Amino acid sequence: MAELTPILPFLFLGNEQDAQDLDTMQRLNIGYVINVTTHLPLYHYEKGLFNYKRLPATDSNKQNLRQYFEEAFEFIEEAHQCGKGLLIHCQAGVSRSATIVIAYLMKHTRMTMTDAYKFVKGKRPIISPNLNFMGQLLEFEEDLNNG
Numbered sequence: 001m002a003e004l005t006p007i008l009p010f011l012f013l014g015n016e017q018d019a020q021d022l023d024t025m026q027r028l029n030i031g032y033v034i035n036v037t038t039h040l041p042l043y044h045y046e047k048g049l050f051n052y053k054r055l056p057a058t059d060s061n062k063q064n065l066r067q068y069f070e071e072a073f074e075f076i077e078e079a080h081q082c083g084k085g086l087l088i089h090c091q092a093g094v095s096r097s098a099t100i101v102i103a104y105l106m107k108h109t110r111m112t113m114t115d116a117y118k119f120v121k122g123k124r125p126i127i128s129p130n131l132n133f134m135g136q137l138l139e140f141e142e143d144l145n146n147g
Contacts, residue, residue, distance in 0.1 A: 002093065005124040010085040011076060013101050013124055015093035019043045025050070031084035034072055036096040051075075059095045061132045066140060072100050073107060098127040103140055113141040 004014040004024065012018075012028065019033065020043045031050055035042055038056035045052060053075050055068040072088070079086040090096035098120060105116035117137075121127050129137065 002124065002126050004087075005093070005120075007101055007105075007120065007123060010080050010083075011101065011104070012085060012087045013093055013097055013120070014087060014089045016040055016043075016089060016091050018093070019087065019089045022047075022049070025087055028087075029083075029085045030087045031082075032075060032079040032086040034075060034086065034088040034097070034100070036068075036088065036090040036100060040091065051079075055096075055100070057090075057096055059090070059130060061130065063132065064136070065096065065099055065133055066136045069100065069103050069107075069140065073104050076104055077108075092126070093124065094126055095129050095133060098124070099129040099133040099137065102129070102137060106137070106141060107144055113137050 004012055004018040007013050022044055033050045033052045036055045036057055038058060042052045055072060057063050057065055076086050088097045088100060102116045102120050105111045105119060106113055111119060
């Protein structure tokens with residue numbers, strides 16, 4: 001039931017239902033979609049209305065998400081740089097996609113992991129990245145701090 005979450009004016013975090021909301025996506029000037037699942041379709045792909053990126057990840061305790069961080073940020077920045085918005089989602093918008101957004105905030109808005117997490121959780125109370133992903137965020141925080 002959770003509603004689509006505006007994170008930044010050009011970045012929205014949501015779930016599978018939001019990714020199917022064509023009218024809302026266009027109203028929000030979204031021109032890019034990141035689907036963080038291996039199995040969901042890229043909804044509305046055949047319309048050629050958006051640029052898509054799939055990060056084929058599972059929500060398992062062994063899934064490496066860090067490997068997709070750079071690609072996701074580049075795509076968010078591409079949308080950002082051309083005045084467009086980006087919708088990132090997974091199934092529930094709870095673990096996979098939430099992790100990528102928190103990571104983006106850590107690198108591009110220089111927030112500590114805790115502040116980025118609280119920032120996203122404050123806007124989207126249902127987020128709860130799994131512990132494997134939390135460990136990856138901590139490792140990413142250390143890497144950012146060490147340049």
